[PDB]
């Protein structure tokens, strides 16, 4: 006899973060083999086509008319925003830094070049 008793395990390749879900920077929204979902707004894409969040926000799945026949995952900076954002409106940006109210810290920062 000779049996075909050999197989790899399942690659855990679902969506790891869902519509309306809060995200943090670096977090993986999708694991996939090839771009089933394309990286949308405020979202990066890795070597393994893994969509990850570039900013803190709300994970949103959407279609964009500019790219028909392509699904997108992006991160809205608030829950208020429809994440296929209006084209000619200005981009919702995050400053994401804090001023150094502390005097010593500010001085150190000024010194550093």
């Amino acid at each position: 006899s000779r049996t075909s008793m050999k197989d790899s395990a399942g690659r855990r390749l679902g969506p790891k973060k869902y519509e309306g879900q809060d995200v943090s920077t670096g977090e993986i929204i999708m694991r996939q083999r090839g771009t089933k979902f394309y990286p949308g707004e405020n979202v990066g894409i890795g070597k393994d086509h893994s969509i990850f969040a570039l900013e803190p926000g709300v994970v949103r799945y959407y279609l964009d008319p500019f790219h028909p026949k392509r699904k997108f995952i992006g991160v809205a900076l608030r829950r208020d925003l429809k994440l296929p954002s209006p084209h000619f409106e200005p981009t919702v940006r995050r400053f994401g830094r804090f001023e150094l109210t502390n005097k010593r810290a500010a001085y150190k920062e000024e010194n550093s070049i």
Binding site: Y38, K47, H87, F88
Partner: peptide, 13 residues
Amino acid sequence: PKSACSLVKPVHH
């Protein structure tokens, strides 16, 4: 290469 995802961005003119 961080990724192979090709995606031409739209323009505003």
